[PDB]
Amino acid sequence: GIQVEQSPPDLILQEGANSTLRCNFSDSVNNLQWFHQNPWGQLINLFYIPSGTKQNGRLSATTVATERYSLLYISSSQTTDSGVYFCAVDSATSGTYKYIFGTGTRLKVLANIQNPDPAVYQLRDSKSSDKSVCLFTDFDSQTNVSQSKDSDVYITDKCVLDMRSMDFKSNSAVAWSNKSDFACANAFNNSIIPEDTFFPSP
Amino acid sequence: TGVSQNPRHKITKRGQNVTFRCDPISEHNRLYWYRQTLGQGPEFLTYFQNEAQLEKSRLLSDRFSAERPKGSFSTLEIQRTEQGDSAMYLCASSLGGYEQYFGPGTRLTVTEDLKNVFPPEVAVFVPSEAEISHTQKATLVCLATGFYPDHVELSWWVNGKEVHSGVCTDPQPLKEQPALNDSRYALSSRLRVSATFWQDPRNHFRCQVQFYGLSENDEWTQDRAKPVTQIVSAEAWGRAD
């Protein structure tokens, strides 16, 4: 009987932006919780909030029981906020208080890159000179890295690292292959990358 | 949270029984089990008030058997496991029916055959001279390949100390053969340091991959080494060359 509708299903934010996530539910509830499931799939509780308001650092929430909705407010978003946010409610028509979870809002927070320097580099294995990977790095956070159409070429998604002491962040993705034919000039061909991406000669 | 679960990871062959355990917060009267499959919200399995099982999902069969014999810890047994049972199994407790506190989960992979289980091969790739020249920074890449199941934890160690600054790891492993059942997996991570730090022969860099595999009491009749839980590492020393 009880249904839960979350909106928006997908959210893309630039680091520092605020946003509001919404959970609509179909009938009176006794219990409501908001959770964060990080990219690793770990489920953490943010708020128990069947009614009223709650504050927790950059996150806050409000549930308007009479209008059957809850809002989760994210202030000054950080890259670590990325993941899936779930709302769960029970029914006021059982007494068991099992939770029914929404289908979630998927949040991607894009790092602020001060001065992108998109480039593709070749890196050799520490042990042997035979093996290498191609590293696409220092691209701006809006860049999308595509999978290869070649089944013997493996390309990872992008991730951001933070060199905390230098006040510096950078994005990267890796491509590799078992093929002796494999070239870094060709590796990320399925991706749409900046026209001024640096491809060193040596 | 105060809620414990064991084991954190479990690999099993299809057609067998497996048992997981939850130890809820002391004094909590209510206990819940949920299942969460890849890229989805948790789904309710069963509920106890004290020792009594008072709600169970209709979607699930007799082969799921939960107990809470002393109104404290609970076990969830899945009989006759199938590959579709691969999921995170989450336990939660509440004092008396209000806020639910969740445990850290048991991640179950059900495989077709234990001969599909392999630990990772791990390699470190050393920084590009061109990167060093262009950016004054140096990125090391760790690549863990050929492992199954996907139950791994990667960490970086600089001079014998775990580092978090300057690191990022793929949030999910990729499939090496995505149209193949029980495909093995690959995972990459980057560690970025200053060029000066990499160029120093006194500095040591290690990528560590903890693999969760077969247990001591798992049978193993294959010719190759038993793919038990183990750490596999790769490492490099800095150098000015």
Residue numbers in the entry:
A (entry chain A): 2 to 203
B (entry chain B): 3 to 243
What do the authors report?
The T cell receptor is a transmembrane protein with an extracellular antigen-binding domain, consisting of an α- and a β-chain, each comprising one variable (TRAV and TRBV) and one constant (TRAC and TRBC) domain. Superantigens are immune stimulatory toxins that bind directly to TCR and MHC as unprocessed proteins, and hence prevent the TCR from recognizing the peptide presented by MHC. Staphylococcal enterotoxin E belongs to group III, which generally has one binding site to TCR, to the TRBV domain, and two distinct binding sites to MHC class II. Here, we present the structures of a T cell receptor, both by itself and in complex with staphylococcal enterotoxin E. The SEE-TCR structure describes the very first interface between a group III superantigen and its TCR.
The crystal structure of extracellular domains of a human chimeric TCR was determined to 1.35 Å resolution. The TCR was crystallized in space group P21 with one molecule in the asymmetric unit. The variable domains TRAV22 and TRBV7-9 were isolated from two TCRs specific against HLA-A2 in complex either with a telomerase peptide (sequence ILAKFLHWL) or a survivin peptide (sequence ELTLGEFLKL), respectively. The TCR exhibited the conventional TCR fold described previously. Briefly, the TCR is a heterodimeric protein consisting of an α- and a β-chain, each with one membrane-distal variable domain (TRAV and TRBV) and one membrane-proximal constant domain (TRAC and TRBC). All four domains have Ig-like folds, almost exclusively consisting of β-sheets. The variable domains have four loops each, CDR1-3 and HV4, and together this surface is responsible for pMHC recognition. Differences in the overall structure of the unbound and SEE-bound TCR are small, with RMSD for main chain atoms of 1.3 and 0.91 for TCRα and TCRβ, respectively. Moreover, Glu69b adopts a single conformation in the bound TCR structure instead of a dual, as in the unligated TCR, since one of the conformations clashes with Tyr32s in SEE.
